[PDB]
Amino acid sequence: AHAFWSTQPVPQTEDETEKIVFAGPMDEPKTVADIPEEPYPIASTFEWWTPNMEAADDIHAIYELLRDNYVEDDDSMFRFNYSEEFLQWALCPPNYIPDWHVAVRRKADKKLLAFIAGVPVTLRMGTPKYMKVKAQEKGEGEEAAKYDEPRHICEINFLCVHKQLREKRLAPILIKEATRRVNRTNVWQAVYTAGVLLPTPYASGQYFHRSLNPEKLVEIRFSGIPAQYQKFQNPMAMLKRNYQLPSAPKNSGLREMKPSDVPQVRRILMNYLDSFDVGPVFSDAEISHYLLPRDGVVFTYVVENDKKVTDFFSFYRIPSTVIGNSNYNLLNAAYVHYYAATSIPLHQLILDLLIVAHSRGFDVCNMVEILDNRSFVEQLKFGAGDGHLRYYFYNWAYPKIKPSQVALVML
Ligand SMILES: CCCCCCCCCCCCCC(=O)SCCNC(=O)CCNC(=O)[C@H](O)C(C)(C)COP(=O)(O)OP(=O)(O)OC[C@H]1O[C@@H](n2cnc3c(N)ncnc32)[C@H](O)[C@@H]1OP(=O)(O)O
Ligand SMILES: CC(C)Cc1ccc2ncccc2c1NS(=O)(=O)c1ccc(CCCCC2CCN(C)CC2)cc1
């Protein structure tokens, strides 16, 4: 029973999605001229506001809203606390559209009540490999390949309704208004992810985490000894020994990424991502934006062997407010971003990610099982978390795929 999602151009059930064999649009074709010029109606007490996400004070306003009202874990222990610097980075990539950053404020006092954001991305989202094999068998190759060209679409993130205004049907209004503004830019698809199940994901993956500071983690999450360590005489010493890391990177030639690295990083990353059914395509400007180091935000290291970049990894920072535990304000988490390995095993490359993160004072490394992230889970002592990340498209029929066929990292 979905009063809003039943009206939208998405597959309505798992059963429906399991039937889809080719990529393509769901809705009637439309043009920009069909789409309302006026913002979607909202109660008189409210007003639409388009923040300027390159302006410090507007960034700070959105920052506070998310700090206090964004995504929590399921047990009221953590709330994401994306930083102001991070929001500017994530929301203002090359060729971003300011109008796609959508807020609602109370008109009387200008209190910020809600937000949703779209950003442009170029995405490969053609029929997946396994369904093209089927299509070929059935003599339907061209129909399966029709939508292979990378598509200039919208990624939606940062949907947030203030906690005081929950369960008032505000979220559907925010979605409708974002949709209208994106459609008015001649864009007709979106990709989005969520921790909740909605109609209807094309892929779903567990979260995995790797403790870097177990004494802090075990104290917050338990807030004493985890069950399987209860058998040791000295559980904390065992925990610390289990998660200990080198104090400096092992790969000779590791260094932070440089602007002159951009084109080589672009080539090795694109060659790698092209192996996945769903993944982004980045220009040099986008590689520069999403991967060059930005203090407190994104950290990227390359393996350089004789002036050649042969491998790289990146991670980004999202602290979470420790909303349950009294002893700590924040948990400093490093999330695995894009990477590519051509000279060393992936586990050896990502060991250095763990070492740098640890050395820079992060408490935990988190990721979803997209890309080849499962290839280093066991070797590097990641464990499954309680979350899942579900991947969705708006106005795009798409067959179920495995999370290891997804190459899009969402921030
Ligand atoms: C071509 C361009 C298209 C662009 C748009 C593409 C689509 C983008 C879609 C958005 C992608 C966002 C990606 C992210 O940012 S996912 C992160 C979402 N944010 C949070 O979880 C932060 C904390 N929670 C909140 O702020 C609120 O609980 C939210 C805002 C989530 C719901 O507010 P509230 O709790 O006050 O409820 P309501 O009474 O207003 O509305 C209830 C309706 O909302 C449906 N609902 C609940 N949660 C989500 C959810 N995460 N995505 C989509 N729909 C959701 C729900 O099923 C129901 O519909 P229906 O079951 O009756 O049908
Ligand atoms: C406590 C650690 C061992 C792992 C950890 C660290 C920080 C967290 N902060 C907030 C929520 C959960 C945290 C967590 N536990 S977890 O199992 O790794 C996990 C559980 C739940 C989620 C949230 C649902 C995903 C929200 C999506 C995330 C991506 N975005 C583009 C749209 C919103 C994320 C991560």
TrEMBL record:
Region (Disordered): 1-15
Matches recorded under PROSITE patterns: NMT_1, NMT_2
Biological process terms in GO annotation: protein localization to membrane
Residue ranges of the TM segments: none
Source domain of life: Eukaryota
Record-listed CoA binding positions: H2, F4, W5, V161, E167, R169, A171, T193
Gene3D superfamilies noted in UniProt: 3.40.630.170
A GO CC annotation given for this chain: cytosol
Annotated keywords: Acyltransferase, Metal-binding, Transferase
Catalytic activity line of the entry: N-terminal glycyl-[protein] + tetradecanoyl-CoA = N-tetradecanoylglycyl-[protein] + CoA + H(+)
Annotated residues for binding of tetradecanoyl-CoA: H2, A3, F4, W5, L159, V161, R166, E167, R169, L170, A171
EC numbers, comma separated: 2.3.1.97
Domain Glycylpeptide N-tetradecanoyltransferase C-terminal: 219-402
Domain spans labelled Glycylpeptide N-tetradecanoyltransferase N-terminal: 26-203
Residues binding Mg(2+), per UniProt: L165
Signal peptide location: none
Family of this protein: Belongs to the NMT family.
Function: Adds a myristoyl group to the N-terminal glycine residue of certain cellular proteins.
Protein name in the entry: Glycylpeptide N-tetradecanoyltransferase
